[PDB]
């Protein structure tokens, strides 16, 4: 697993090189902006059950065939597996946010996930939609100006969006 710092170190080590000033500057900026990253992780983590439930309700309002009998989310066992999958993906995304690198999400969650759903008959495009709904909810929560010190989190929200988008693309 890599965080943003280890990624830069690994890239540098493969070339046998000390860090450049551009790399130092990028990592120092990540540190200086660190409080915002911690808030995003904290806020999304603290609201995770809400993000999952509302994204699931939205998914099934939009794709009612999933909850018709015979649909992939019909029976409480399959519905519970689906909700669990949404929470798993969200959990690994919060790890990527803390790390500032997608490696943990790629290696421990996304790798092989498309094939897993194909083998099950779970439609990956529906999982991608669930993920995108969680994205929008997580970012509205993480970027909410209420009860937080005013400042610009837009670069971080784009980074967060990219992790969600990368997860959706992995199953789409």
């Amino acid at each position: 697993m890599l965080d943003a710092f280890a990624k830069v170190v690994a890239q540098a080590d493969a070339r046998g090189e000390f860090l450049t000033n551009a790399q130092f500057d990028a990592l120092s900026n990540l540190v200086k902006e660190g409080n915002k990253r911690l808030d995003a992780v904290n806020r999304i983590t603290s609201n995770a059950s809400t993000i999952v439930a509302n994204a699931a309700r939205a998914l099934f309002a939009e794709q009612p065939q999933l909850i018709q009998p015979g649909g992939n989310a019909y029976t409480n066992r399959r519905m519970a597996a689906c909700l669990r999958d949404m929470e798993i993906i969200l959990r690994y995304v919060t790890y990527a946010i803390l790390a500032g690198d997608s490696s943990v999400l790629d290696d421990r969650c996304l790798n092989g996930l498309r094939e897993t759903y194909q083998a099950l008959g779970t439609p990956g495009s529906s999982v991608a939609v669930a993920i995108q709904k969680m994205k929008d909810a997580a970012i509205a929560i993480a970027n909410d100006p209420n009860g937080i010190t005013p400042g610009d989190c837009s670069a971080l929200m784009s980074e967060i969006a990219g992790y969600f988008d990368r997860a959706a693309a992995a199953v789409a």
Binding site: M1, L2, N35, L38, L98, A99
Partner: protein
């Protein structure tokens, strides 16, 4: 790779759970420490060649036989001196990487794993590399906690050679 941030993630993942408040506080602490630690890494990087060159001489002055004993494993020859300067550069680079990442992981993974086997197989004396390390610790010219963070990873390397 072990860092304070990946350690926190790994603990949460091991238990299938979201990150705890105590894990976020651990990353905050890493961010607070990163300031001086990255200061040291830039300083060492900017003066690396002087430190490498000076460290090479420190070793030869402490162990003059490495100057003249015939053998691959000696700085006997110009290629031996190249290999030795290279290795010293490797150790310094690893210290910069630990300072950048906030812990020992880069040196654990890229240098310490297998170190004893490499030094044994290739007839390389650990004392050689310890002397190089002591010279870097005394001549990097850092102070305050930048020197604290740096000398921690230096001592850590000396210990792995002991």
């Amino acid at each position: 790779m072990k860092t304070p941030i990946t350690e926190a993630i790994a603990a949460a993942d091991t238990q299938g759970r979201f990150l705890s408040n105590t894990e976020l506080q651990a990353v905050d602490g890493r961010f607070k420490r990163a300031v001086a630690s990255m200061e040291a890494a830039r300083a060492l990087t900017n003066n690396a060649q002087s430190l490498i060159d000076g460290a090479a001489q420190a070793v030869y002055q402490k162990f003059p036989y490495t100057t003249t004993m015939q053998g691959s494993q000696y700085a006997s020859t110009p290629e031996g001196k190249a290999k030795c300067a290279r290795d010293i550069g490797y150790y310094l680079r690893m210290v910069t990487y630990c300072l950048v990442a906030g812990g020992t992981g880069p040196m654990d993974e890229y240098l310490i794993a297998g170190l004893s086997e490499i030094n044994s197989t290739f007839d390389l004396s650990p004392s050689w590399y310890i002397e190089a390390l002591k010279y870097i610790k005394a001549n990097h010219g850092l102070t305050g906690q930048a020197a604290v963070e740096a000398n921690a990873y230096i001592d850590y390397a000396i210990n792995a050679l002991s």
